[PDB]
């Protein structure tokens, strides 16, 4: 523990489903105020914030072609409710022989106290995860 | 609400055709020092900053396999005017059936007042900037 | 000038065989405590830390499909003197025409004093340090 706000959850393996962030410890993190809620963080006070976040996705041979992976950061205000995406990619994997594709989104934000920030994928079944640090969600006030 | 200097521009959707970064945006930066000129950021005071910039590359099936995707973020200092390549990373997407591909560089560097940074890519064709948080550059004074 | 401990490696071009990480100057950084041991960062003080990397990987066409890209960052504490995967990351480029292919590695971690970070790869024969910016490793006190 120490100064400022900060964050830095990770991906839940026994959750094979979905995508669940969890505060585990190697040094996965969560504290000064800011709070792990429905599976999404939450900044303490108004400042500047960086947003990070990984995910890894992995496949055993294409399907077609028609394969999209997607990754998103965004941000929920009290006052509305609803997801502006604030960093968002996507991948096209396609076009034994396994296929890795990951995906990284970094950046600094203007964040209000209250705000709620979530990282979503949109195809969680070939989200990869068979080890430490291969999908991991964070943020830090600055 | 703010103190160090800062900024976190993004692309240009009407600019269908080059790489245009622009900063009059809701949760865009640009403050404290920092401006944009000329299409590049102008560090205010000496220190140590973060730089980020992530770009993403979309295509409706590939001409035959002889493609690169590259994106850059170069340094400018006032008197020896030349660029400096301080994050540089490269993409082959070749080798119907559409492709994403996105590209995500981050550094921490010792910048001098007045120095002009900026971020380029070679195939602006190529840009899709189709939704929020898919193109953008940014750097934080540390 | 700045004051936290900070560092920011870089490949070696003419270690054309292994990834040895570079200080002098620059460009990069290595100060205020941080030191470059055993190719291997060391932390000063106890606290938050931003650990970023990259690398870039190049090949000329494809031997078959069986080829798998990784990067990673691993702890090691004063206790227990064992690895830890912190960042990891993995990459298919096969599904004379060459091959390009980024990975990008960003977090923060809650750091010990005598802690050695480390970024290693499983193929150093595609690590292209041929342009600058392209293979770098660093981290910074937050």
């Known amino acids: 523990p120490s100064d400022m706000p900060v964050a830095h959850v990770v991906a839940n393996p026994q959750a094979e489903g979905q995508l669940q962030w969890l505060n585990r410890r190697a ?23 960086l947003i990070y976040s ?4 992995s496949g055993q041979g294409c399907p077609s072609t028609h394969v999209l992976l997607t990754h998103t950061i965004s941000r ?3 006052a509305i409710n609803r997801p502006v995406n604030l960093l ?5 994997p396609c ?19 209250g705000d709620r920030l979530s990282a979503e994928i949109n195809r969680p079944d070939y989200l990869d ?3 430490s640090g291969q999908v991991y969600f964070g943020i830090i006030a600055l």
Do not use: H, K
């Open 27 to 49: 040094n996965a993190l969560l504290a000064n105020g800011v709070e792990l809620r429905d599976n999404q963080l939450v900044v303490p006070s108004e400042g500047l914030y």
């Open 54 to 57: 990984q995910v890894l996705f």
């Open 76 to 78: 929920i205000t009290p």
């Open 88 to 92: 968002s990619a996507i991948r096209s």
């Open 95 to 113: 076009q034994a022989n396994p296929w890795y594709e990951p995906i990284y989104l970094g950046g600094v934000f203007q964040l209000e106290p």
């Open 129 to 131: 995860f068979a080890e």
